[PDB]
């Protein structure tokens, strides 16, 4: 059994669409692509150069294709994404000229990939696929970065597949720009009481 970590950049109101640039994802006429862009300092770069250490990867086709247009040319900066196997969930794509790309089609294939032997799995972007991972409680860990911004519209990290669940805060951090790094571990069922 492999660990599955979801890593995500979200706004205060949990919007995850198009962190990195104005055109990264225009679904809905989304106007705020690049909202992650004013909150990048050098200690943020060092916090997630360690988050970038080599692993295996699980991605939705759309996030795969956003990555495949850029990262094959920048293996200097992020070698992990280029060397590790990238398992990609898709029904419309079966091959890619990006090295070490495998294509899964089913919830069964994800479960086998998890049960199979090998390195821990990182999940970047992939909002729609994350919905399926959440709904089957396959997500073992959450690394989040919460930015001081609210954007009513936009694809969300906790969306359709969010289930009731509990977590442990493994560790946390803050950024000179005011970004909270939050690191949760899956922790069983939601507990209630009275205050």
Ligand X SMILES: NC(=O)c1ccc[n+]([C@@H]2O[C@H](COP(=O)([O-])OP(=O)(O)OC[C@H]3O[C@@H](n4cnc5c(N)ncnc54)[C@H](OP(=O)(O)O)[C@@H]3O)[C@@H](O)[C@H]2O)c1
The entry of a second copy, ligand X, none that residue 150 binds, CB within 5 to 8 Å by partner kind: a second copy
Q: Report the residue from 67, 103, 143, 184 that binds a second copy according to the rule CB under 8 A.
A: 184
Between β-strands 121-123 and 4-10, what pairing exists: parallel, antiparallel or unpaired?
A: parallel
Please state, in angstroms and rounded to a whole number, the distance separating the CA atoms of residues 183 and 48. Answer: 12
The Cα-based distances of 180 to 8, 53, 128, 143, 183 in angstroms read 12, 21, 24, 11, 10
Task: Choose from ligand X, a second copy, none: what does 116 bind? Cβ within 5-8 Å by kind.
Answer: none
Among 47, 51, 72, 132, binds ligand X (CB under 6 A): 132
The C-alpha atoms of residue 143 and residue 53 are separated, in whole angstroms, by: 14
Window 54 to 113, contacts with ligand X (CB under 6 A):
60-63, 89-93
Residue 16 contact, options ligand X, a second copy, none, Cβ 5-8 Å cut-off depending on partner type: ligand X
Distance (Å, whole) CA 66 – CA 68: 6
The single residue among 58, 121, 133, 182 that binds a second copy, judged by CB under 8 A, is 182
Kindly give the pairing relationship between strand 56-60 and strand 121-123: parallel
Assess 14 for contact with ligand X (CB under 6 A): no
What CA–CA distance (Å, rounded) separates 80 from 141? 19
How far is 113 from 166, CA to CA, in rounded Å? 24
106 closest CA partner among 94, 121, 89: 89
**Interaction between residue 45 and a second copy (CB under 8 A):** no
Examine residue 164 and tell whether it contacts a second copy (CB under 8 A).
yes
* 3-state SS assignment for residue 18: coil
57 contact, one of a second copy, ligand X, none, CB 5-8 Å limit per kind? none
Among 113, 129, 179, 182, binds ligand X (CB under 6 A): 129
Q: How many residues sit in the footprint of ligand X (CB under 6 A)?
A: 25
Specify the residue, 113 or 179, whose C-beta has the smaller distance to a second copy: 179
163 close to 27: Cβ distance less than 8 angstroms: no
The residue from 2, 22, 24, 47 that contacts ligand X (CB under 6 A) is: 24
* Binding stretches for ligand X (CB under 6 A): 8-9, 16-19, 24-25, 60-63, 89-93, 124-129, 132, 155
């Amino acid at each position: 059994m492999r660990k599955i970590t979801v890593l995500s950049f979200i706004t205060l109101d949990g919007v995850m669409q198009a962190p990195g640039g104005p055109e990264e994802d225009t679904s809905g006429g989304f106007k705020y692509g690049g909202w992650t862009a004013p909150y990048e300092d050098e200690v943020s770069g060092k916090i997630m150069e360690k988050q970038m250490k080599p692993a295996d990867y699980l991605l939705g086709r759309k996030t795969f294709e956003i990555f495949a247009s850029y990262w094959p040319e920048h293996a200097d900066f992020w070698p992990g994404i280029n060397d590790g196997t990238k398992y990609v969930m898709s029904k419309t794509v079966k091959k890619s000229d990006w090295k070490n790309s495998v294509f899964l089609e089913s919830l069964a294939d994800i479960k086998k990939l998890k049960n199979s032997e090998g390195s821990d799995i990182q999940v970047w972007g992939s909002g729609e696929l994350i919905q399926l991972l959440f709904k089957n409680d396959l997500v073992d860990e959450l690394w989040l970065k919460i930015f001081p911004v609210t954007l009513n519209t936009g694809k969300r990290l906790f969306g359709d597949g969010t289930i009731p669940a509990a977590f442990t805060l493994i560790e946390s951090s803050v950024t000179p720009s005011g970004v909270i790094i939050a690191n949760y571990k899956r922790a069983g069922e939601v507990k209630t009481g009275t205050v």
